Design a binder for this molecule. Structure first.
Ligand SMILES: [Mg+2]
Ligand SMILES: [Mg+2]
Ligand SMILES: [Mg+2]
Ligand SMILES: [Mg+2]
Ligand SMILES: [Mg+2]
Ligand SMILES: [Mg+2]
Ligand SMILES: [Mg+2]
Ligand SMILES: [Mg+2]
Ligand SMILES: [Mg+2]
Ligand SMILES: [Mg+2]
Ligand SMILES: [Mg+2]
Ligand SMILES: [Mg+2]
Ligand SMILES: [Mg+2]
Ligand SMILES: [Mg+2]
Ligand SMILES: [Mg+2]
Lengths: 129, 139, 51, 180, 61
RNA sequence: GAAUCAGGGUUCGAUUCCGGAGAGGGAGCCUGAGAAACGGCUACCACAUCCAAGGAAGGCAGCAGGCGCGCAAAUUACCCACUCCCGACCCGGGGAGGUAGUGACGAAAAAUAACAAUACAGGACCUGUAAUUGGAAUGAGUCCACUUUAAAUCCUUUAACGAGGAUCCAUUGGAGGGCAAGUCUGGUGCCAGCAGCCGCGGUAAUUCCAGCUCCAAUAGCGUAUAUUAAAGUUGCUGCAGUUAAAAAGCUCGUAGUUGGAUCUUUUUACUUUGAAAAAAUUAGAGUGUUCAAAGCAGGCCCGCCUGGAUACCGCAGCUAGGAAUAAUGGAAUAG
């Protein structure tokens, strides 16, 4: 069955990206996905996304700009210290110039450049570039 | 596929330890059966006694007579066959002559066109066979 | 039949060596290898032991 | 138990491929230009550079306000400049990665003897070092691989006991005059 | 390269002090100290013979 | 800790530091603060030593040495001077330790020529080639003396000599392809042989045996064997499973593993920080051991100045912040 909601969300965004579609349904909306998409949206890879409330786990319609190469998840959510973070950088990211590893730290769901500034580790959710 | 979950280290470590046995280089270096079966006994060299000069025919398409010696070891009494490498170095060896043998290149496997022979003679009566060949020393 | 052994090495006619000039050894031998390859830029590739 | 130290390291790494003609000719040019006796001396200088680069690439990955990057980065840069392989205009950490091994071969004593006109050839310069005719400021040096620091660049001079700088000509010139 | 050698110097106040607090090989380099001539192999063979004899009869052994 | 190593790893650690163990095998004890002690006793087993046959004495996995075993490993050397230890002790003792010898285990440095003129070749005044010539420079070696040190030896220093074929002579492997380097010459004729692998040799052998040349790395270089990388051919990162090796005949099922969304926009796990963590080794700072491997030294004109850093040290345990993620807990017979 469905064990991981974030994985089915990012696989469906990734499949619609290479099909060249403009919009995509994301079924069940959790709050972890919403906090994941905003980090993708502040760095500007996706457009505005509409969240639909249906008195259960809702749906999200996402506008795609056409900028995304690959949004992936990492399973399990390995705990990552700041010592080991740069070894995840050259295994997930295509370059040191762009791309982000998304962490969930105690100060919230962060990309990896923000976690160095805040000096905290966390569990890894996924990545996008 | 493979289990990925965060508590599956025992399943992964034990499955690995079982599946290490299915290749040749791990199996022969950890059973000890092959260590029991080579006559060196895990050593690189051994001294023995030449019992007999033997002629070994080369595997086809090669058509020569490979000059070898039938050697009984001093360490454990195992009888082996060692090759005598060079043009006419069989004439330096006699019977009841104490030689030093070594491996022959492929770490226990048979080499070249000589069937069932995996050793070669190095020293003959405390004199290296390369020196008898080049005229450096004498018997 | 272990009779014929050392046959070709015995039937080789013996040719003594020619006592010749001492080879230079050390840094100076590398001086020759640098000169004979990178200073002689004559037009022309042929190998160095070609006959 | 004994009061002996056993700390030792090698100074060269032999290359992974034994025979590629691109690399063989490339290491031959450094020998002819700089009068080196064997390819181990090319590899020793090549190995010296790689340790500096591994010390460099480690420090490019830390952030710019870490104390260890500021400390060991500056102690790496100052050691490169006082031996002259790096300019004081290029005092940033990234410029270590642009260096070549010809900069360290430029700073041998055998190189800097010849490029001050004290010798006639770079093959001649290595001979004058081993025969104790060259001094740095007060020390006779018979080591051609002496990396001469930038502070003691001025002080390269002929020796005092040497016939080329001082008195007492050599035993060939004397026993010629002893016969006459 | 020659020219320079470097050592230690030790200037005492009066010579009886220099006989008092000095190594006895350093005083023997100036002809003052006289050690006896006996190898320790010769001196250890004599000791083990003395342990086999008890009493005043060690003195002639 | 060591070797390898992009990141992960894999293998090793008898071996000079810490801890343990045993003194031929076991067992029992005395003394003492401390021993189940073995350069202490007491047995028995094994072995072995003198003997007048009545008896007596034994324990090198201490330093040397010898035998044996083997592929496999050093002098029956000098000394308490340094380091320290013990004693009643400033004085004695130390095969601890130190110094020499044997030492291609290995590691660092570094000779075996340099120049000039000719003879020549070139290149757009510069350079190369020579069994031509020229006197210039030095060590190797020999060797007084100092120094060194317990006394020496070696290195360092300096006289005396010490180079032309500078005979004061550089080897080890190769030359079909992998893979740097010859379709040279002579012999052999599927023979002798080579060859890690594919291969070569049966009368014109680019591969054998030799000569000539040439290549490679060089005071080192082959060879055997363990092992690491190569190996994404053990796959955590990272492998495969239609037909190449391979998904159980099918379903149930306990462990195990993994578990939907939900809330501010109790115990833990996690994350950050603090302690406490043996040095050596590693990383690394400073410093011209003549350089370098090293070493912890040193530097400046009566003495003065100055170093002997810092990091790292899985996990577990401890400490204070953080509260996303992940478990978990409170009021439903209201007890
Ligand atoms: Mg004990
Ligand atoms: Mg024993
Ligand atoms: Mg006992
Ligand atoms: Mg003993
Ligand atoms: Mg040995
Ligand atoms: Mg000792
Ligand atoms: Mg070496
Ligand atoms: Mg020589
Ligand atoms: Mg080849
Ligand atoms: Mg491997
Ligand atoms: Mg790899
Ligand atoms: Mg495979
Ligand atoms: Mg099949
Ligand atoms: Mg089926
Ligand atoms: Mg959930």
């Amino acid at each position: 069955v469905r064990m991981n909601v974030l994985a089915d969300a990012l696989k469906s965004i990734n499949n619609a990206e290479k099909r060249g579609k403009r919009q995509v349904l994301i079924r069940p909306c959790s709050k972890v996905i919403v906090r994941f998409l905003t980090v993708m949206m502040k760095h500007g890879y996706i457009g505005e996304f509409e969240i639909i409330d249906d008195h259960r786990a809702g749906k999200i319609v996402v506008n795609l700009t056409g900028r995304l190469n690959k949004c992936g998840v990492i399973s399990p959510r390995f705990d990552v210290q700041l010592k080991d973070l740069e070894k995840w950088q050259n295994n997930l990211l295509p370059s040191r110039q762009f791309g982000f590893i998304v962490l969930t730290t105690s100060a919230g769901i962060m990309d990896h450049e923000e976690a160095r500034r805040k000096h905290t580790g966390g569990k890894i959710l996924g990545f996008f570039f | 596929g493979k289990c990925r979950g965060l508590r599956t280290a025992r399943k992964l470590r034990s499955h690995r330890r079982d599946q290490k046995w299915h290749d040749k280089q791990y199996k022969k270096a950890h059973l000890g059966t092959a260590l029991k079966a080579n006559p060196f006994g895990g050593a690189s060299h051994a001294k023995g006694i030449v019992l007999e000069k033997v002629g070994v025919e080369a595997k086809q398409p090669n058509s020569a007579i490979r000059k070898c010696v039938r050697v009984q070891l001093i360490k454990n009494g195992k009888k082996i066959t060692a090759f005598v490498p060079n043009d006419g170095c069989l004439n330096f060896i006699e019977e009841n002559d104490e030689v030093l043998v070594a491996g022959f290149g492929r770490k226990g496997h048979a080499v070249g066109d000589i069937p069932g022979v995996r050793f070669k003679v190095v020293k003959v009566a405390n004199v290296s066979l390369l020196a008898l060949y080049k005229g450096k020393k004498e018997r | 039949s272990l009779a014929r052994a050392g046959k070709v090495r015995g039937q080789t006619p013996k040719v003594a060596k020619q006592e010749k000039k001492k080879k230079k050894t050390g840094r100076a031998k590398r001086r020759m290898q640098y000169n004979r390859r990178f200073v002689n830029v004559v037009p022309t590739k042929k190998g160095p032991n070609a006959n | 138990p004994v009061a002996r130290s056993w700390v030792c390291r090698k100074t060269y790494v032999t290359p992974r491929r034994p025979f590629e003609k691109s690399r063989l000719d490339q290491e031959l040019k450094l020998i002819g230009e700089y009068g080196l006796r064997n390819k181990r001396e090319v590899w020793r200088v090549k190995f010296t550079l790689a340790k500096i680069r591994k010390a460099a690439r480690e420090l490019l990955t830390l952030d710019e306000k870490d104390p260890r990057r500021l400390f060991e980065g500056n102690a790496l840069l100052r050691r490169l400049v006082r031996i002259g392989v790096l300019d004081e205009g290029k005092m940033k950490l990234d410029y270590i990665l642009g260096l070549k091994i010809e900069d360290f071969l430029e700073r041998r004593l055998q190189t800097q003897v010849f490029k001050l006109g004290l010798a006639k050839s770079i093959h001649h310069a290595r001979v004058l070092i081993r025969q104790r005719h060259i001094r740095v400021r007060k020390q006779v040096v018979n080591i051609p691989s002496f990396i001469v620091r930038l502070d003691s660049q001025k002080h390269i001079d002929f020796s005092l006991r040497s016939p080329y700088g001082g008195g007492r000509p050599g035993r060939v010139k004397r026993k010629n005059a002893k016969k006459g | 390269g020659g020219g320079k050698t470097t050592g230690f110097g030790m200037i005492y106040d009066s010579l009886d002090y220099a006989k008092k607090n000095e190594p006895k090989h350093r005083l023997a380099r100036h002809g003052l100290y006289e050690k006896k001539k006996t190898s320790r192999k010769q001196r250890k063979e004599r000791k083990n013979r003395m342990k086999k004899v008890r009493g005043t009869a060690k003195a002639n052994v």
